[PDB]
């Protein structure tokens, strides 16, 4: 900030101030589980269940 001062008035200081901020690191997983029978049914009948 600026300061207004007289002729022989003592000047001040008003320096800028700074701070850091930090990213967190987030690991996201999705796991889906199914019987080999579901693979056999889908791959034989062409259901599209594993593609979806």
């Amino acid at each position: 900030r600026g300061e207004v001062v007289g002729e022989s008035a003592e000047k001040s200081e008003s320096t800028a101030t700074f701070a850091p901020v930090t990213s967190l690191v987030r690991k996201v997983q999705v796991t889906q589980r199914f019987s080999q029978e579901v693979k056999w049914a889908d791959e034989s009948r062409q259901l599209g269940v594993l593609q979806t």
Binding site: V30, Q32, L47, G48, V49, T52
Partner: protein, 51 residues
């Protein structure tokens, strides 16, 4: 008595074509497409919930 067309009994002229009140078509046939099907009840898979 004088001669009249009453005595001749003419047949009426028959106009071509048939007059009709129109009918509404299917809406379902316009709004969703037909698919190829084989004779019997069909079965379809639906997603109940995502991972």
């Amino acid at each position: 008595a004088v001669l009249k067309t009453s005595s001749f009994q003419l047949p009426r002229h028959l106009v071509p074509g048939v007059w009709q009140k129109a009918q509404g078509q299917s809406v379902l046939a316009r709004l969703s497409n037909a698919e190829p099907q084989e004779f019997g009840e069909q079965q379809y898979m639906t997603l109940t919930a995502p991972p």
